[PDB]
Symmetry: C3
Subunit: 353 residues, 3 copies
């Protein structure tokens, strides 16, 4: 929504209101889930080949009481500059380069995008303090090939004992799993012109001393790689992705997997009158999980999804999503770690601007 | 304040800033009370008989320090469809239908509207997970008759060690009084054309397992009913309302009343040059309150209010409100529950958009 | 950024997104420091000599995880009237008159403004519940002489013991150091026309009963005064200020200074091509610090800064700020009171609107 355009500067507001209800036997997911997003995007024309921009995206939950706490948080906040064809650079809270692939399959009515991607988890998704350089023609060598170089500085929690550990942006009571040391990321994507497109991403970062000592994943670095393909043409949206992670992905209340194998696939069709059904599959196979002095292999995430979204227009929509969780509810591992096994049904009515 | 109207979407930002001070010997309310509201109203034209809309209202306190917590919370957040004459349906955090009457007498400069209305109190006021269907002229057959059908799903907090209690949207350390089970609400109003209007509304809801056991109110449902009349014409506003509530409305630090009888009346005139006096009286008589193993009938809220508002224009106003509290300060009952005994004088200067 | 101007009502949205990083050996400062500001400025024309205005400024941190608490708070929120040329009166959360001087030297790239200025510290900076009368001609006596009269109501924390102590707007565990009683403020400024301007301010405030009893600053009133001069012409910006405070300025984890001597200077040049280096010095000499049952004189704040801001245009800028800290590193006073001694280097890229 363009609301300002004077003196070579543009400011657009954007957000949504999601009237959302969950039907699920898991009493931690069942119930009202109404939330909203508010934010702005502005961009200023410095000169004919230079532009500056900043972006804010805020999440505000509306399903708890006005006395409830911590119902609002920021998803994105970054500033950046784009030098025409030479590329762009941004810094702040932005998406991890790994998400350059995961976005292709993070396109379900309500659920999805969570086989291995978590917020504040190295560069798996949205991260604090990422410097991201991107370019749309790979240094002019290949038109249509996107490239990304990304670097994320340390976000380490302090210790009440010695005051020389950590960074400002992690409280002492931080969950150690969502901390990280410094790290870089690489990603690139291509559209072949036939509606078939490919992308891949690679990141590698150090893990904080406290992660090496207090988590049940052993090792000094967190690494990830992903590739994906999508077919987006003739009213069809097909997107699949495979990924692997080492000493990075969390699971349960207090677990890190030394290794994961992850797969997602989403198959969708777009009817001309507004209905968009979608069939999807998501899996995360944990590996070498250190439980009680011994290793074991368990599915951390595994569910099939069927659902549809109906678009009245670009500004209003409603949808249903059915998450059929295939994790074994009779495997005590899940309850023990607090990983839910139950199903969810989502009902959503969404205004956008 | 309409800021967007392009390609079939309309978006208005709205809110106010209230520079507000309270003068009172009750030390938990005396002092600065400055707050502001920010939010939006969005409406999109799907086609000639269909409209989508979304609404956000934010409450942001600005009367405490930049270090304080929980100074901001969401008042309203819903998405909806209006199908011409067939009516409207929306879901999310919206007003309860009991407020179809209470809004008539909650028309004071600053105070008011608090005989039986509490936020997050089933559908007494604003509630989570309420679906509200409204029809504004009975399908175009009868002018001036609005009716509303409303449904509110269960809002209950967990149990510390039982995984069978609660909702996603209520934590265990929530006050159980502002919890609720499923329930429906009905409301209707009619304006006979002479500036007098009559309305009544009725709600009945289940009470949660925790509500029946941890509070001082017994019963398996929480229900309330109310009727009111308003005369709104020729710079005169008289509105009174009567209500009854059973096993729902809270009082004091940790109390819910088995029965309340509540009445409010407001007499206001609007002068041509901008002065709007307000004569109002508000009372809620509690019944069968369980204090220490014995029943009691005591006044929960009882005061007379006088005040005036001066409107500079549609965007600026200032006011003084005098709440003269009629509850007996020497009755040890009140301080025991933390129920106010003191008078309040409010002076506020309000910028609006 | 003007987004509304209809029927004598204007609404401007304003704020910035700062991609900010600090490099510092202090683990309470090192890391990502990315934040954003959001707010509006509204003005309506009541009539030919009357204007209403409201303003909100919000700070939102985006440097901690979506799980973090208290990443957002209000810096400013006030409503007011301007009687044309006769001056202005506004109330709410606004700046203390002392900052009418401090703002001149609080103009460094990143750092600065912290010799003695802290938020919610009587009228040193932003405060709750300030009523401010302003005049652009000193009651008609002297054209060009700005005058300010300001009154701040009691901001006193409640007591769990006596429930008639304190104000509504100070929470259970509130720090009494940032509390305050009643107090008045006076301020004035003049532009001599050759680029030299002078300003001075004086405030005196009562302190709360608990402030006299629970803090290491002895006395029953908190007082401060400041004067400063600036040269702002010929691409040179020179500003200095000297200030003194009594029983008001805080320091460290649990400290109040019985007296402070404060000096700031910032020297800046603005090149025509957009670079603006700035060299500055800031000191606050603490005096009569009752730290361990004994009085002491310590530098509370003392550092030099060198840095530059580069302005792409009115909407985008990037900068570097190098703060060289002069405090005595081998002094147990600092660690014992928790005042950091280390340097910080900041790198920032800023979008503004």
């Amino acid at each position: 929504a363009e609301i300002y355009n004077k003196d070579g500067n543009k400011l657009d507001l954007y957000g949504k209101v999601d009237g959302l209800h969950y039907f699920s036997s898991d009493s931690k997911k069942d119930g009202d889930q109404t939330y909203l997003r508010f934010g702005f995007k502005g961009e200023t024309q410095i000169n004919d080949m230079l532009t500056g921009y900043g972006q804010w995206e805020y999440n505000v939950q509306a399903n708890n009481t006005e006395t409830s706490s911590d119902q609002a948080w920021t998803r994105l906040a970054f500033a950046g500059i784009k030098v025409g064809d030479y590329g762009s650079f941004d810094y702040g809270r932005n998406y991890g380069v790994l998400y350059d692939v995961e976005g292709w399959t993070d396109m379900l009515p309500e659920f999805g995008g969570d086989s291995y991607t978590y917020a504040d988890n190295f560069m798996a998704g949205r991260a604090n303090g990422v410097a991201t350089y991107r370019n749309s023609d790979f240094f002019g060598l290949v038109e249509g090939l996107n490239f990304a170089l990304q670097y994320q500085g340390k976000n380490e929690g302090q210790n009440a004992q010695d005051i020389n550990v950590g960074t400002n942006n992690r409280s002492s009571d931080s969950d150690v799993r969502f901390d990280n040391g410094d790290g870089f990321g690489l990603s690139t994507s291509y559209d072949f012109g036939m509606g078939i497109s490919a992308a891949a991403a690679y990141t590698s970062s150090d893990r904080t001393n406290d992660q090496m000592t207090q988590t049940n994943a052993r090792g000094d670095k967190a690494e990830a790689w992903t590739a994906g393909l999508k077919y987006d043409a003739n009213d069809i949206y097909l997107a699949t992705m495979y990924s692997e992670t080492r000493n990075m992905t969390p699971y349960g209340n207090d677990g890190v997997a030394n290794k994961t194998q992850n797969f997602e696939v989403t198959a969708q069709y777009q009817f001309d009158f507004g209905l968009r059904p979608a069939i999807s599959y998501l899996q995360s196979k944990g590996k070498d999980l250190y439980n009680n002095g011994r290793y074991a292999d368990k599915d951390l995430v595994k569910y099939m999804d069927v659902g549809a979204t109906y678009y009245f227009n670009r500004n209003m929509s409603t949808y249903v999503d059915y998450k059929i969780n295939l994790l074994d509810g009779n495997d005590k591992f899940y309850e023990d770690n607090g990983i839910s096994t139950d199903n969810i049904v989502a009902l959503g009515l969404v205004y956008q601007f």
